[PDB]
From a paper:
Here, we report the generation and cryo-EM structure determination of a complex between Shigella flexneri LptDE (SfLptDE; >99% sequence identity with E. coli LptDE) and the RBP of the BASEL collection phage Oekolampad (bas018), which has LptD as terminal receptor. Oekolampad RBP (RBPoeko) binds to the extracellular face of an LptDE complex in which the LptD barrel has dramatically expanded at the front to form a wide channel connecting the periplasmic space to the extracellular environment. The monomeric particle class gave maps to ~2.8 Å resolution and showed clear density for RBPOeko bound to the extracellular face of LptDE. RBPOeko inserts deeply into the LptDE lumen with a total interface area of almost 1,700 Å2 as analyzed via PISA, with a complex formation significance score (CSS) of 1.00. RBPOeko forms 20 hydrogen bonds and two salt bridges with LptD and two hydrogen bonds with LptE, one of which is between main-chain atoms. Most polar interactions of RBPOeko are with LptD EL3-5 and EL11. A superposition of LptDE structures shows that RBPOeko could not bind to the crystallized, “resting state” LptDE complex due extensive overlaps. As may be expected from the insertion of an additional β-strand, the “laterally open” LptD barrel is much wider at the front of the complex, with strands β1-β12 and EL1-EL5 displaced outward by up to 7 Å. As a result, the pronounced dent in the closed barrel between strands 5-10 has disappeared in the open state, and the barrel is almost rectangular in shape. As a result of the conformational changes, the open state has a wide channel connecting the periplasmic space to the extracellular environment with a minimum diameter of ~10 Å, wide enough to allow passage of hydrophilic LPS moieties.
Residue numbers in the entry:
A (entry chain A): 198 to 208, 225 to 760, 764 to 784
B (entry chain C): 22 to 115, 139 to 208, 232 to 321
C (entry chain B): 19 to 25, 29 to 168
Amino acid sequence: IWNARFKVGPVRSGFLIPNAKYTTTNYFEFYLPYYWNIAPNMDATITPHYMHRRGNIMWENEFRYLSQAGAGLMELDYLPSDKVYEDEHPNDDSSRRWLFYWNHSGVMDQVWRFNVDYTKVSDPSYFNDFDNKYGSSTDGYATQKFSVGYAVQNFNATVSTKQFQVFSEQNTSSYSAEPQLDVNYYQNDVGPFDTRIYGQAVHFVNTRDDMPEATRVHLEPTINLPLSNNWGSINTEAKFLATHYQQTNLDWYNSRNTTKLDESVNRVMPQFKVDGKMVFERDMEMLAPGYTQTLEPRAQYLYVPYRDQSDIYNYDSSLLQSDYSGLFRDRTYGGLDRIASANQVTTGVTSRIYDDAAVERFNISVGQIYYFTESRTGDDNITWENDDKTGSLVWAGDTYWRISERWGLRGGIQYDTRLDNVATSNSSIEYRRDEDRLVQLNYHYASPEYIQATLPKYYSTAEQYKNGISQVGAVASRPIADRWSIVGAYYYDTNANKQADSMLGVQYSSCCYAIRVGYERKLNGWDNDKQHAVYDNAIGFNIELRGNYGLGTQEMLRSNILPYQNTL
Amino acid sequence: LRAPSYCTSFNQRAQSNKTLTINTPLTAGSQVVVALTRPVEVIEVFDQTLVIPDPFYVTSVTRNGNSGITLRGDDAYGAYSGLPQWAGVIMEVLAKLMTCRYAKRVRVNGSMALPVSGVPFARWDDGNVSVGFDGGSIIVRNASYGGIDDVAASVDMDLVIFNNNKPFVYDRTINIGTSDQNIGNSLIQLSYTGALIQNNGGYNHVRMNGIRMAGNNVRVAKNRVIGNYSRQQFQMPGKNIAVPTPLLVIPNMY
Amino acid sequence: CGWHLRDVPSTMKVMILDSGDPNGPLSRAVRNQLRLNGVELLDKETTRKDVPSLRLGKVSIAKDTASVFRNGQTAEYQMIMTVNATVLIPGRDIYPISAKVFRSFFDNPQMALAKDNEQDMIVKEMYDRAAEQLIRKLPSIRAADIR
């Protein structure tokens, strides 16, 4: 398929410069902003946005204020009647489309904080149809959130609440905290130790009437013992975890599942960690005079007991993906519902190279985790290529070489023996003289076994997900003169021998205007009948009115589905 | 023409994963005929804080050696396990007989509860509508409409209901599909013929499948909406499933 | 080889920390890192003026798409956290320093309540890696200081 775009427009209380837009999906659109200076602490912006395909004007109203309570912004878009909505949604008697957004922020004194994030829409398809400037949706629902805080250097106390706007045509499941209390308290230098307390009280309510609800109270006292030296350091930490659940609305879930949820659940378990670190160094005069190379071993032992948590519903815990720095992490899930047991030791080594100015140039890291006992969370269901549970199972690497002030190189590998091969890997080499000149190379890999263990179960059966990732990329940029600029990017998939992305843009900059032309051929869906991918070709014509500078690069390079990122 | 004899009728969930065993006395040298009235069931499966719609449909029927039958099925994505609820009537070609206890040309406006419990057969003539059957009601929808709204429709049909007054006699069985098949001047069994998952309006739009009868040709068409799940949470590959279980076709002599 | 145990520059063992958001997540990470290294942190309003001052600047976090599936759906994300800071040596000039942290991960479909707990853990770990990089750049400031 093919698409085309054409935009023209810009980059006291009066009219602003209007901007137009034509696309071969929604046709002509026109914006006519107006600005109003109500007061030194109040202003408004009325922008009638005329949509040709919908056959009416959407009135976009904005109001920014700054009063004693705080500074906030309100928004109200209103379309009196929608022509496309009548055809696509005949079950609705009306056609009014509207969105109300409210934001607020207030700092009483220097410690108190107030926040409001309020959103409402008229129908469950407003977000899909319109490119709203303001307004946030969570899992498709418009959310209203309130928050009050209190933060000093050694204390925190935040109470908040979030709600969804659910329509009868929406079936998505989502939990929210109504309300949630978080308290932190730090008191270091308690003799040789440091102390810290964390507490939380939360209530979970689902958008559906058949999902469980719970109230959870958590306490987490911690005490440290940090010992340091000129060459090494060891930190011993003790922690305690106390949780309480009060689960209701369990009738629908219990009847359909063999493992029953429980009304009152108490999870009480300690945690013990010992983290060590050493640094060596050597005068690396066999490579270049005045250089230094350091070798930095590191080891950590973590112990957490085993508690059966199958009678707790999983509200907000998901598995964490790991890198080299995640080998020393003391948590496996993000949340407080799943807390896997741990009996393991992590070992790693990192070696660096410093030049004569004590500026680091090269570093490399290798690490592994050895499990003395399998990490169980009660609800253990993970697909693995092998039945191995104990021993050295995880490996990870890192590399960063700064070849010059303009050359850079990076890398990272991951090797899991429960998959019998390389899990993930990525690399990148870039030359970048200035903002307009750069050449970059990419490679991203992910094994089919890694996707089966990590991603949802239907990924491993679909042809569009089951083969993993193997991608080669190339980005380039070059200015011809003081007013021209060319960019380009090509991404390729070596598993399927088909490209994934291809971009080409040119911009002619001038004193008062800039003209940009772009082209992109990208993967834009599947066929589901012939079992092959669908490509989308698009051309873009853009005219900017200047009153700015810039040759257009770093904006053209970030326009495709695989945006350029400075990896130097 | 055949004259099967009534044996039993079941409506229950599977005992094990995708397997429902029904025990009933059987005689040697008889052709067991099973008329599925609920061959599909969209179960919600839990996968790591995700609630996912997943159709479960019957694949094959096996006779358990003069003691019963078993129904084995599968899900849309072939990755999730569950216990689906299936319904039907078990008969035997070789002693009660099902009788035609209802025969009337009716006007169904979106939905209609069966006047009398039984196995409904019907015929109609409309290409913009599809007809389904959830067990207690007849569902008529607008199949030419592309959207996420549950848009109903109306149709005139000849409705006949058999339960256990003329005996139940059928001449052919048909495997419905995406292509037209002429059934002649005959009535076809009413049921859901599969389920659909679609990318429509920013949602994982789920529908049931019904029967489209224009002239005398029958194929599969979209039907009652099951749910809309936002693609901001997860995205699913599109599915369009027509069950391999046959449908009974009876002569138009009732 | 000729290895030997390593023997923060001694001129920066007492310093002032200014951030504009002293209760923020970055400043908390920096203070912890300048505690394991035997550095005493003075209040912003010290009478003493012969101590260096570390002023934490703007912090930017950018997450973009790194890979796609065969349908064009986002497979992997890449987050880059950039931290700016300056160290003021009294009598000397200003020595800016910076940190840049990289992190790649798969876009895992989760409920949004569970999914922002995973994002709030990745960002917390990138604050500790950015604080460590700012401490490794202190020896290079002392070298530049001694022209």
